[PDB]
Each structure stands twice: as structure tokens, then as C-alpha cells.
């Protein structure tokens, strides 16, 4: 899939919201809580599953090369770049 | 800064120069109109349109200037290919 | 000729040279692919040649001293060297 696809863009906005929440919450979980109260189980579980879904979609999204300015669709190459970076 | 700042800077310097020597209101008017025109967005049109390949500039010209050049009587060669040239 | 040259990149969909207008710059292709296109007398454009590697167009106009035999539009990002 090319990055300009609409559904990928909406998913990127959703994962941006989740990334903001995780970035704001992780220091507060580390500092003020040793362990967690049982009321925060499903929150962490769903956050982790959302970022796993992000990992896979990423295993499949194509990109654009910088040196040749030509879009690259080689699935082995996109997987290699994702593994590398 | 921005162009609205370059205009005001140049006009402030003129005003200093003109009122320092007590020039006169009519030439003040001519001066203000002159600076007003060269310090607008209209006086850089040919200036920025120097790097667009030429191909796109060709279509911009053929969309903007075509009726003006076509309405002149001298150009009655009737070859609209010559006209687009 | 080399000491007077310039490069340029064209995105797909553009037209480098129209058959109607006389050539003013002739372009040597060094990268990318582009298509040669004479305005067909049937009322269409058809297809002639796909000039991808180490190829130039517009020269035949500079020799024949006539209009461009083919309109030439791009296919993908092409690194073209241009001489007036």
C-alpha cells in the first residue's frame, strides 16, 4: 500500500493519538506507581495490542526512496528497511 | 520579516529624506504611488517565474495572455499555432 | 556542449516537448523513461518509442529545420540534461 491511501492516513492519526497518550502516561506509571492498581489492566493491554497492529501494518506499508526520488515497492526491501531502522 | 515590512522601511526612509528637505506634496504623491507599485506582489511576477521548467510556464502563458495577444490587429496571420508560439 | 548543460527532473504527466512549437532546448535523457508521441492524423496520439537510456530527442528538429515530429511526454521521474 502507498502512503497516500486514505485509510492508512486515518490509522496514522489514530496511532498518533495513542502515541501521545503512551508518551504522557509512561513517566507517570514509572514514577508515581510501583506496580499498578488493578483498575488499569485493560488500558495497558489494549495499548499494547494497538501498537502491535501498528507494527504489522508497517510490515506492509511502502515508502519513497530519497536518493532516486522513485517510490520503492519491493516488499523484501521494505521489510529490510523496517528491520534495519 | 515580510514584504509589508520592506515597504514600510523604504517609505520611512523616503519620508525622512523628503521632509528633511521640504520637497512638496505633489511629488510626495508621485513618490508614494511609485513605491506602492514596486513594493507589491505584482512587481516580482517575471522574477519568480524564472525556474519553472518552461513547459508549465507555457500553459500559464497560454491561459493568461492568449486573448490579449490575439485581439491585436497586426496579428492576423490566422495561424493559431503561430499565435501560441 | 558539456560545459553548457543543465539537468532537470520531471514528474509523471508532464509534457517536455510539443510537436506544434519549434524546439528551443533539446534534452539528453540520462535517467528515467519517457515516451515519443506524434499527433496522429486520425485525431489521436498513438505511441512511437520509449526512450529510457542514454538517448536524446529534439535534435532531429535542429537538423530538419521543421517542427517537432513527435510530442514527448514523461513517464516517470526522469533525469534529463538540457541544451539550448
User: Does A69 touch chain C if contact means CB atoms closer than 8 Å?
Assistant: yes
Q: Please count the CA atoms within 13 angstroms of the CA of A52 that sit on its side-chain side.
A: 6
Q: Return the C-alpha torsion angle A33, A37, A42, A48, nearest 10.
A: 20
CA distances from A53 to A15, A74, A83 (A): 10, 21, 16
Q: Which residue of C has its CA nearest to B79?
A: C20
Task: For residue C34, count CB atoms less than 10 angstroms from its CB and return exposed for 0-12, middle for 13-18, buried for 19 or more.
Answer: buried
Q: In the structure grid, which three cell numbers stand for residue A79, read together?
A: 521489510
Cross-chain Cβ contact B85/C16 below 8 Å: no
Burial of C57 (0-12, 13-18, 19+ CB in 10 A): buried
Containing A71, the helix (H) or strand (E) segment is strand A71-72
Query: How far apart, in whole angstroms, are the C-alpha atoms of residue C16 and residue C14?
Result: 6
CB C55 within 8 A of CB C29: yes
How far CA B55 is from CA of B58, C17, C24, C62, C69, in Å, comes to 5, 8, 12, 19, 17
User: DSSP readout, chain C?
Assistant: -TTS-EEEEE-TT-EEE-SSSPPS-EEEE-SS-EEEE--BTTTB----EEE-SSEEESHHHHHHTSS-SSEEEE-S-EEEEEE-
Residues of B in contact with C15 (CB under 8 A): 55
Do chains B and A meet with 3 or more Cβ pairs nearer than 8 Å? Answer: no
Under 8 Å between Cβ of B40 and C1: no
- Please say whether the beta carbons of C56 and C29 come within 8 A: yes
**Complete edge-to-edge strand list for the sheet that includes strand C26-29:** C6-10, C78-83, C26-29, C55-57
Q: At how many Å resolution was this determined?
A: 3.4
What's the rounded Cα separation, in Å, for the pair C40 and C37? 8
Instruction: State the Cα–Cα distance between residues A75 and A68, nearest whole angstrom.
Output: 18
In the numeric block, which cell numbers belong to residue A70?
Answer: 522513485
Contact map slice: C 9-48 vs B, CB within 8 A: 10, 14-16, 18, 20-22, 24-25
- Tell me which DSSP letter residue A15 carries: H
d(CA C40, nearest CA chain A) in Å? 31
Q: Please state how this structure was obtained.
A: cryo-EM
What are the chain C neighbours of B56 within 8 Å (beta carbons)?
14
Amino acid at each position: 500500500i502507498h502512503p497516500k491511501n486514505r485509510w492508512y492516513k486515518a490509522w496514522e492519526m489514530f496511532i498518533l493519538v495513542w502515541a501521545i497518550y503512551s508518551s504522557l502516561f509512561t513517566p507517570m506509571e514509572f514514577g508515581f506507581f510501583r506496580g499498578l492498581p488493578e483498575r488499569l489492566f485493560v488500558l495497558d493491554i489494549v495499548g499494547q495490542i494497538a501498537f502491535l497492529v501498528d507494527i504489522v501494518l508497517q510490515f506492509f506499508v511502502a515508502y519513497r526512496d530519497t536518493q532516486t526520488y522513485r517510490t520503492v515497492y519491493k516488499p523484501t526491501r521494505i521489510a529490510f528497511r523496517y528491520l534495519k531502522s | 520579516g515580510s514584504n509589508t515590512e520592506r515597504f514600510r522601511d523604504k517609505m520611512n526612509d523616503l519620508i525622512s529624506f523628503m521632509n528633511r528637505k521640504k520637497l512638496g506634496r505633489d511629488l510626495r504623491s508621485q513618490i508614494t504611488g511609485h513605491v506602492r507599485l514596486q513594493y507589491d506582489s505584482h512587481y516580482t511576477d517575471t522574477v519568480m517565474l524564472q525556474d519553472i521548467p518552461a513547459s508549465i510556464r507555457a500553459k500559464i502563458a497560454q491561459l493568461l495572455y492568449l486573448p490579449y495577444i490575439k485581439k491585436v490587429p497586426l496579428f492576423k496571420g490566422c495561424s493559431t499555432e503561430f499565435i501560441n508560439q | 556542449i558539456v560545459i553548457r548543460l543543465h539537468e532537470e527532473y520531471f514528474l509523471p504527466g508532464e509534457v517536455i516537448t510539443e510537436q506544434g512549437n519549434v524546439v528551443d532546448h533539446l534534452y539528453f535523457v540520462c535517467e528515467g523513461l519517457l515516451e515519443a508521441l506524434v499527433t496522429k492524423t486520425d485525431g489521436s496520439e498513438e505511441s512511437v518509442t520509449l526512450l529510457g537510456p542514454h538517448t536524446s530527442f529534439g535534435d532531429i528538429s535542429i537538423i530538419c529545420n521543421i517542427s517537432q515530429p513527435f510530442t514527448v511526454r514523461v513517464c516517470e521521474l526522469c533525469h534529463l540534461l538540457r541544451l539550448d
